[PDB]
Every structure is written in C-alpha cells, then in structure tokens.
Design goal:
Elements: E1 16-17, E2 23-24, E3 28-30, H1 46-53, E4 60-67, H2 84-99, E5 104-109, E6 126-127, E7 149-150, H3 153-172, E8 177-182, H4 187-192, H5 207-210, H6 212-225, E9 230-234, H7 248-261, E10 266-269, E11 277-278, E12 283-284, H8 285-292, E13 297-299, H9 305-313, E14 319-322, H10 324-328, H11 332-337
Parallel strand pairs: 3-4, 3-14, 4-5, 5-8, 6-7, 8-9, 9-10, 10-13, 13-14
Antiparallel strand pairs: 1-2, 11-12
Helix pairs in contact: 1-2, 3-6
The structure holds flavin mononucleotide, Octadecane and picric acid.
PDB class: oxidoreductase
Keywords: oxidoreductase, cofactor-binding
Assembly: monomeric
Length: about 350
Amino acid sequence: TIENTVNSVENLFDTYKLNDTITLKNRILMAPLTRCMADANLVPTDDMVAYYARRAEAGLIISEATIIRPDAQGYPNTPGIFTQAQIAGWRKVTDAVHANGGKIFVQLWHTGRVAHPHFFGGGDVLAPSAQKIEGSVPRMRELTYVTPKAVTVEDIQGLVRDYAKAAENVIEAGFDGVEIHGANGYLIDQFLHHDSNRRTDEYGGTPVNMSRFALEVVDAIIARIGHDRTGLRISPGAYFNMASDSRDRVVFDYLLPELEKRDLAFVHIGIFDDSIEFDYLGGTASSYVRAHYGKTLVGVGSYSAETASKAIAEDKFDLIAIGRPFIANPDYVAKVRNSEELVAYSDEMLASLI
Ligand SMILES: Cc1cc2nc3c(=O)[nH]c(=O)nc-3n(C[C@H](O)[C@H](O)[C@H](O)COP(=O)(O)O)c2cc1C
Ligand SMILES: CCCCCCCCCCCCCCCCCC
Ligand SMILES: O=[N+]([O-])c1cc([N+](=O)[O-])c(O)c([N+](=O)[O-])c1
C-alpha cells in the first residue's frame, strides 16, 4: 500500500522514455499552477521566466494554464498563446528552461462557463449548455459568474481551430509539447460531464457524443504538432466547478480506450488529493484511469516523494506531478534527491513569485 512508505525514492530519478521524441531525465513533473502574474497583454514576464527556469531539474514542467483566445479568460493576468507578443514571451521561458537542461509543455486552456466577461470586453461566455456556475471569480471584487451561451456547432468548429492554432504557436514558442487542459471543470471537461453538458445534438447525450469535442481537439492538435508532443489532463471525478452525476463514469469508460488509440505522450489526472475515493468511480481517480487506460499515466494530488515513489513502484501510475510543494520549494527536486527538509505549502505563498 502507498502509506507503507520506505526509506528510498530512487525510482523517482529513473529516466523515463515518453516516446521516440521525448525522454525525461526523471519521473518528477511540475504540475500546472496558475499564478496570475502575466502582464497586461497576457505576456509571460521576465519574472515568470526566472520562476520556471529555476525548476528545470524537473523531468518535465507543465506550465500554468495558458488561454487559447480572449474569451477563455476567467482570472486576472493569466497568460495566453494567441498573439505574437505572447509567443515571444513564452520563447524566453522555454529557452531559459532548455538552457538549464529542462523540458516544458504548455497547458492549453479554455475556461468555458468559468470565463468572465470583465476580462474580454463584455463578450459572451461560452459552454456546452446554458448552465451557470455558482458564485464569483476568486480574489476579485464582485465578478459574478454569468449564464453561458450554449455554443453552436459553428462556435465549436472555431474553438477546435483555435486550439489547433494555439498548438502551432506553442511550437513557434519553443515548447516541447502541449498538455491539453481537459480537467478541473473547464471547457473540455464541461463536455464530458452531465452537469454542464445538457446538449441534445451530436455533442451531447451519449458517451460517444459527449466525448466528441475532446477527441476533435486532441485530433486537431495531433495533426498540427504530433502525438508525441500531445498530452491530456482529465478529471473523471467532479470536484471543481462541477456537480457530480452518476452517469459520467460511462463517458470516461468510452473516452479512455479512444484516447489510447491516439498514443498520447501521457494522460494526467486533475485532482487535489488522489487519496480521495469517488463513489461513482469505484475508488480513487488514478486507480479508475489505470483500470481503463494502459499507457503512460501522470498521478498527482497530495503525494509526498515517498508516497509517489511507492505508488509508482506498485504500478499505480508512471510519473508524478507535484504542485504545491514546488511552489514552497523551488529546489524541490534537489531537496528530495538529498533527503533535505521540505517547507510545507501555505496559500500565503501565492502572493510571491519565487
Ligand atoms: C495555486 C494553484 C494553481 C493551480 N493551477 C492549475 C492550473 O493552471 N491547471 C491545472 O490543471 N491545475 C492547476 N492546479 C492543480 C494542480 O496542478 C494540482 O493538481 C494540485 O495542486 C494537486 O497537486 P499537489 O497536491 O501536489 O499540489 C493548481 C493548483 C494550485 C494550488
Ligand atoms: C488557490 C488554490 C485553489 C483554491 C481552491 C481549491 C480548489 C479545489 C478544491 C478541492 C475539492 C473540493 C470539493 C470536492 C468534492 C468532491 C470530492 C469527492
Ligand atoms: O485560479 N485559477 O485560475 C485556477 C486555475 C486552475 N486550473 O486548473 O486551470 C485551477 O485548477 C485552480 N485551482 O483549482 O486551484 C485555480
């Protein structure tokens, strides 16, 4: 069991060959972490360059969620990858990571119903269905979420196009690849769950239909940059801006074998504590995916180096993403390697970019 941790995490430092294109120097990923520190043009800053560069001992960094176009924005100062200036800013980031001997994927984002018009000139918020989430944008003054417009099939075609274009830009920006943000209640995840997807056309109703948008985005991006440079984060368990539905599991039962056919660089779980068991999944999120998907899997969520090592030793998943400890400890990898004390994460640390 994972709690029976041992006195060595050597396996975390195994070389891991993702595919013919990419080999990782270790199994430790920096999880994607929104920091809200990009400039007014949503361009990565030189402070962001330094922040990523100092974490290049990670086998692979997954960037903070990066928006594909303006109506994807739901939080302040989140970087994009749709303008030339943004591409240039990211190129500074990737160049610095590579110069430090690291690798980095961008996480491509559209927030769907979690966008807010304050950020993009009062335009329409888009989602599979006109189902508003509760509340307001965190850490902002009174920005109440709004009822989305249910996307038309023409909207959907444009969105697929824009995911694909962003992927092309990612290559110009010198990233090693893309992690498609299909998790945590955002646009792609919205198509995959019944709470948000009440459609009755070819994008709703059945597992095949509800999976259609995800697969169209994945296929369009592969067509642009190749399967070896394409990963996907998913959240089979509803927990963030998403109500649960007992019918969601069969959507993922369909999706996962379909994803296997695309021979992705990895599938990555989106969750905060993977020790949590989901009734509807019959156990933990990672164990559910591991039972329905037989290629590289990134685990995440409240793992220590020790419990991650044990999980990987027990074949529960292949790579470990580390989030909050990488905020608290820029030198996470070195400290783990040398058995040094790690600082515990505190939410207060988000005020600083170090
Ligand atoms: C401040 C913060 C920002 C996050 N931003 C993202 C993000 O941009 N994209 C994403 O998929 N997950 C995001 N997450 C979730 C993390 O990637 C990760 O799944 C979560 O922090 C659990 O892992 P951990 O226990 O090692 O921190 C974020 C989490 C935190 C705490
Ligand atoms: C500033 C960092 C993020 C702050 C908000 C946390 C978002 C994730 C919340 C974790 C899970 C809560 C609800 C889960 C419901 C279903 C669980 C079985
Ligand atoms: O504030 N945020 O923009 C934000 C974004 C993401 N995300 O996944 O893209 C999160 O998972 C969280 N989160 O749950 O902490 C926050």
